[PDB]
Amino acid sequence: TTGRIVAVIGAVVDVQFDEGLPPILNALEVQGRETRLVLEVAQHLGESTVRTIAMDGTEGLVRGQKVLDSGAPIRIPVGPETLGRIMNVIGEPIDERGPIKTKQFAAIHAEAPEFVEMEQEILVTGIKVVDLLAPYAKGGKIGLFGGAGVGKTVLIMELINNVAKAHGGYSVFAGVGERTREGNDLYHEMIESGVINLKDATSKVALVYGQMNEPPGARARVALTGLTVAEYFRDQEGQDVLLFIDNIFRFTQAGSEVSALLGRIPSAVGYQPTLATDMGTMQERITTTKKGSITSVQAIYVPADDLTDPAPATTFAHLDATTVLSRAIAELGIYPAVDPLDSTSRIMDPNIVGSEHYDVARGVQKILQDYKSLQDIIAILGMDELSEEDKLTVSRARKIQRFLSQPFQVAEVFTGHLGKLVPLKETIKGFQQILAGEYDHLPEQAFYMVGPIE
Amino acid sequence: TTGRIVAVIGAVVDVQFDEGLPPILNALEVQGRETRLVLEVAQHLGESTVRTIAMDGTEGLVRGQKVLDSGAPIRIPVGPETLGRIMNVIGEPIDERGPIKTKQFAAIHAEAPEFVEMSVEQEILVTGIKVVDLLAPYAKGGKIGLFGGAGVGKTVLIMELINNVAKAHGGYSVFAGVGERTREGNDLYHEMIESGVINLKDATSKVALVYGQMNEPPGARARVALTGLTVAEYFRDQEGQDVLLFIDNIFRFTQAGSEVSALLGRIPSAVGYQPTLATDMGTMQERITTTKKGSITSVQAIYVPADDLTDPAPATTFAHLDATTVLSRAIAELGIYPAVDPLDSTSRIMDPNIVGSEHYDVARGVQKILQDYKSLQDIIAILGMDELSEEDKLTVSRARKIQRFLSQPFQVAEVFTGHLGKLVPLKETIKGFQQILAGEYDHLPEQAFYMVGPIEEAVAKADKLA
Amino acid sequence: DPAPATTFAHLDATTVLSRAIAELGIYPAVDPLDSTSRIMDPNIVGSEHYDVARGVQKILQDYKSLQDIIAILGMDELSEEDKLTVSRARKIQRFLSQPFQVAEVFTGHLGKLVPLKETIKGFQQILAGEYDHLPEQAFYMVGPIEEAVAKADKLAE
Amino acid sequence: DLEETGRVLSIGDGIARVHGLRNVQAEEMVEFSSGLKGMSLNLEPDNVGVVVFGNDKLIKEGDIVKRTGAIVDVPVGEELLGRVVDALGNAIDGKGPIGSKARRRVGLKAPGIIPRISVREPMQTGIKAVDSLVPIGRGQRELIIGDRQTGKTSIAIDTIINQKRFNDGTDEKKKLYCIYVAIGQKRSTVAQLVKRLTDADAMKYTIVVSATASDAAPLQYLAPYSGCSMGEYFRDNGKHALIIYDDLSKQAVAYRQMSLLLRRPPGREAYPGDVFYLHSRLLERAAKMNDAFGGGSLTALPVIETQAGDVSAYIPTNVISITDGQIFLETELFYKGIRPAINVGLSVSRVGSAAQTRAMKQVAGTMKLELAQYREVALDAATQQLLSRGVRLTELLKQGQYSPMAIEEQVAVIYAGVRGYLDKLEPSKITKFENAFLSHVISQHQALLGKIRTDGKISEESDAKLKEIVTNFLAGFEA
Amino acid sequence: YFRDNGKHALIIYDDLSKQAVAYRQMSLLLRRPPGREAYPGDVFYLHSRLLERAAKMNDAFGGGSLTALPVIETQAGDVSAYIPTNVISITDGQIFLETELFYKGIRPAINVGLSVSRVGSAAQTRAM
Amino acid sequence: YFRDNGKHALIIYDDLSKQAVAYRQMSLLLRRPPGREAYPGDVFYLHSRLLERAAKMNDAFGGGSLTALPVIETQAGDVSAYIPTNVISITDGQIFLETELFYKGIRPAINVGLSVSRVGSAAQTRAM
Amino acid sequence: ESTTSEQSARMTAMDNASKNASEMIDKLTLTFNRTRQAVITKELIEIISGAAAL
Ligand SMILES: Nc1ncnc2c1ncn2[C@@H]1O[C@H](COP(=O)(O)OP(=O)(O)O)[C@@H](O)[C@H]1O
């Protein structure tokens, strides 16, 4: 059916229908515009009028303007044809390479796998500090923490780059509040490193952007669009997919802004009253089914650095691990700027990763937290009051510090130096040694910004 | 005259009358219910409709259901036949022992005693609890409030007061359980039957029980304190005799009021509370009082939300009291029980012309040394006592001993302290603090003054520690 | 607060008063680290005026940043340079106080008016160390610097 | 028919406004054409406001609504045992219809003063630190509180696993049926829990009620009342049930969402003024019934999640003010390897000491005093001795997961420690000591253990006997 | 009545905190929308119009006067809170009493630096 | 105009805090729903669409560019207040100024250990 | 003997001071997050209360 706009108040549009009202969550198409303008039904107000949230600007709209009910919620192209393409929240190509010719379409709203529809594994990143000290597990949710400009996104890029192996190598990147400058940079890097092939069908990543300059309903729904692209790979083609959500805070804020626009009373600290179910309905879809799994890496902004703020606090209930980057580490020159003493896993134990890996990791935290103690005394009293023993813990430690550093393929455009992808094998090994001393004479450089121990 | 329900939202029910509107405060009875369901008129909405508050659950009510006006406010049994019984908010027996056959009934709503009825007599009520008697002593016929965060010790302190004051009190007692644990009501009832304070065979019972606990809907928790105080009024007056009234916990009246204030259409005030918080409190509190006709010694536990003594509920209650005992979680976590804040507990009776100059000078000296210590703490926070100066070192050691000698094992807490209970007589509480302040025990270890009775027990414990 | 925060953009100079300064008996209770003027520029008031005013702000800000270490590790733990920051800042704080003529009903002191050159000189001399020997209370509630040198003599009995 | 049916006027913000339903009762379940259920909350002169127990996008203006005639209720009985249901009681485990034959209102008021008696039978968790120092009795409400990842759920799961010894035994009065209410948790987590219970063979006596993180708020709000009514079925029929609410923090967040959508005035942390009552009416329904009411019980272990160890916040304090004590867990204790991460000094059981076996009583007493004295000191041989015992006792309270211990074994272990048989040991060797000793008494001294279990105490003989066993074990102890 | 008839009167308002609370109830019940701290947006005007009436009259008006001592109750010693500063901003001074001094034996418990008189020595004999 | 015609423009918005205050006035007076600090739910988008117009064009489009330097005024250093959080998240970096640095003599009062530039070296000359 | 007794005492003392401080940082940090959250919530409830009252 076709209805009429009866009200326009910024990004909220009320639409009246004479016959058959579009249920809540349905997509309406406004008629008479140069570019597609989708309205998502949010409420039924009574008197045959629906209140909707716009997915693009509403300037120029007239009361009386026609609006079609699509007969379903927002639907987008899903399938291999999404690989190497850039899509927006309503599934339109924004990379200018024409139509996205899939054979199917999928609703961006979907219930999670039922109680009956759902063990532990490990996902090799090829990034020594992560694979060693706080490895990711397929099917889980990983929070990625870090101050502005520290390297979170660069890290996301390397992860997408390294994943192209074992369980397949498919990735979906959902940019929630993507800065347009950066969406151009990420695209160009994906092409450059080959993960996106503009020539054949070997692309391994699909891109979905919900840009900063879009209205709140578009930013709130883009994570779901990204999620829908990934569900296809897991469900219809049995893959272990990777879903990147950068940044999950802006999914939450876009939801808080839509709630405010619909006149709902804000909850504690100004968040939407539906904060937990909003997070809940999205996250629960990210899980391992018999048909396969979706692993997610979610960059998380922490308001005022308060981990008890409602947004990070609600998000944490859904994470199985974390990757914590640090500016103090970036400024002293080590990339990736991971804090080896603050990353964890709901599942990193000998039973799982296996004694070897375990011991190598744990042996590295003791040296580090041991070198940290000696820092004062070294700086104050002089790096000499150290006993021959303690003096040993220092050189080993400093050596381990830099072995944790790594040149990224995607970092070549910056440093100009070659990148390296390090196998768990070559990673676990090289770190096991240090203690030994096979490198005491070996200086702290064949250790800084290198790949394999060799 | 009969009316019909036109709206139901939780505890608030609107009722339309075609003839004769029931005045505000009248008790209405809902027809067609298995158990009596009272609706108390709260407002006249206009158009022959009144707005009411239910005294029990409203599940199963239908629009159009009939209601009758009883012609008066909620009225309950009062008099000697309430003694040994348990009644609910509308005065019904909730102890399975049959009807309460009194001769008299009283409305639960009534104007407070007027200014001309006030009494100005002030006399000490000794509790045998050192920190209370020394620093912020209770008065016979006075209002006592026990402030405390969750689980800090208000009920345990009430039970010790019942045990030290009541059990051996001339007259009658009324205990009104308001918004607390039903199982505590079962604990109290059984203990009173076991001691004989309540007798199920004779007419010798000395206490009347009134309960409306945390399983009840808000209108019942908002009125149950009025039911309890109404029973107490009768013994105060209609016998002129000295009654003890315990309420646990009066904050629950104000909390129940905030649940319905929303359903009543009011714009909320600070912290989401009813705009009427203080005048509702005042109309109830001004009846809980000693008058020229007779005396009421009331003891009220006062919950403190999120441990915030500035929350509007506890904060507005302070003005209604003659003695305040403030409990602190921090103190409880240091193992000091009763967990009374000796610099935030006050009494209108702490005046040298009333308790005499020696009690008064020792209490003021204890408070000065404890505030001096508190003040040093603030500056030692980081650098311990070393940097401190020997004379201040003496304020610290003494203040620390005084803080522990304020602790005391209660008869009702033996399971938690693993220490037999102690009752310390007033003159001995004074002597012991007088001695500590004079330096008579500067050589005893701190630990010796912890969890004992009189000062001779600290000395013994000192020897035992050797 | 929205009212005063919105007023700042309408002014060319601001004098901000503070209860925490008033409480110490320093009147006028001007916060010397939150009072600004569009003409406080070396090309307008000259480099001497400008440099002394910035040196007064710097020493007052450095003293403020140390107060909570003094109070905890004691003055003895301070460097000697930090000790000079302290004694001089505390003297400069008192020299910024002044008996006003309209405030004699409140101070018990005769009012004073200090010419711009005498103000500049007094503060430049304190910063330079010329009065490290005088007690703090000498700079409190006076006008010109000569008045503090005389109060120091008076106090010395 | 506008008496028995009605038509949706509006929907959004979770409330459905309905025209008609003239005969509906306040709090009656109503049915939408789509198959969803709702509860009549507001009766107004020109509409009925309905809370929807599911997703409201499946409801549209004009949709037909019909009365059920029944106040909100759920199926109850022994049929629910071994099953996984949603907050309305529908099966979600795929094993078919619930064969229930009786239903019970979710909002029934708790028992009054007369039908009760003080708790007096042990509710054994199998966890040494609780059974000895924070004893829980049948009928009691004991809060489990602490930050995220401190081991709150794990205490609950071990408690449920522990009951198998009684449930697979003869003495019916010792049995304990379990209910685990999952509120706002992840699906995968609930599924993992059911597999764990299934492998431990504890599911056969457990009901799992689930309203996870993507279920609509009203189901999350309802779930605890539903499980409670399933537990009441045992309470009132001379049996004993144990209910875990995991957790009430998430239930209060779901309730705050519903309240704010209804425009009720926000208070502290934006919670509605009736959020205390939400919990108080629920937990009052856990109770111990005297013999004239059949002698049954319902024990509750509500869970509360704190933020940075702040137990003075609004919801935590609310719940502390309803329960009969609490078991406080702390992150610092966890990280240091104090697992279970229970803070002994701050934890309390307000009524459970009366329900602890004499045997445990005759050893937990001195351990309590000995840890009380230790807690002060953590040179001078005396304070130095206290330190020693305290360090060994702390090691004894450490315990892994999934191996809840029989009470007589706990006593045997606590005995070694309070009687001094561990002092001349490396702090580092207590755990190895404890396992080897337990396999020993278990293999070679069942009878003695059977004795302590049967008598419920340690006789003068059992004490002399035990003195010999421990002694002769410490000698040969190689480690 | 005294002020305007050549006489001198002293009034005590004990206390204005409780009066503002009663004014906020009446106003919210009349449905005037609340402002800060849920008080009506003119809570300052409630007290300023009242306190302005305490005055000293000239001789032509008979030379009488009315002196006022309003009372405000602070919470946790916060003298710079909104209601308290509103009243300070009205009166010709304040006497601020603090609990720490009170228990130290400093009674009257006057915080000297935070207390002021806006008339000063003009209200004291020469001897004082 | 310069951006799209092969030229380079620099725009300064001094300041955006005031622009958001003007928009809030209109939103509240048209009775749109107030959020945190009374700002409407689209105040983020007001700034995000303004700032995404700054850009560096490709050669096909003329090579021109538009650089933006928005100004935000904080209150008592709160960089986590609503409007500041919004503009920090939108931009490519921030130069943080601080009153303590300023009066200590650090002028310009830039906190270089906290200021950010995600572009960094890519925009510097080789010697710098 | 004095130097060894001096240095032994200074260590122990700075050790306690350092532990007291870290405890002060935890109370303050937690005070700070709770207060920051309550200010935003409180300011917003005042806005909504005034809005809804019209
Ligand atoms: N691995 C890296 N190697 C070199 N430079 C890096 C690396 N990661 C980040 N950078 C530098 O930091 C800038 C910001 O990185 P980015 O990923 O956008 O930070 P974030 O997402 O955390 O805000 C990059 O543009 C580059 O200048």
Ligand SMILES: Nc1ncnc2c1ncn2[C@@H]1O[C@H](COP(=O)(O)OP(=O)(O)O)[C@@H](O)[C@H]1O
């Ligand atoms: N005087 C006391 N001595 C020892 N423990 C006490 C004392 N008062 C309270 N406690 C401890 O605190 C628990 C809760 O006390 P209670 O008075 O019931 O709390 P509330 O303040 O909530 O009424 C008691 O069961 C006991 O363990």
Ligand SMILES: Nc1ncnc2c1ncn2[C@@H]1O[C@H](COP(=O)(O)OP(=O)(O)O)[C@@H](O)[C@H]1O
């Ligand atoms: N006694 C224990 N020993 C070892 N690990 C434990 C123990 N108790 C819990 N854990 C582990 O700690 C983690 C957190 O436990 P959990 O019960 O889920 O905490 P919470 O419910 O408070 O979030 C889980 O992986 C659990 O297996």
Ligand code: ALF
């Ligand atoms: F148990 Al309470 F106040 F917390 F009585």
Ligand SMILES: [Mg+2]
């Ligand atoms: Mg980034």
Ligand SMILES: [Mg+2]
């Ligand atoms: Mg109590």
Ligand SMILES: [Mg+2]
């Ligand atoms: Mg858990």
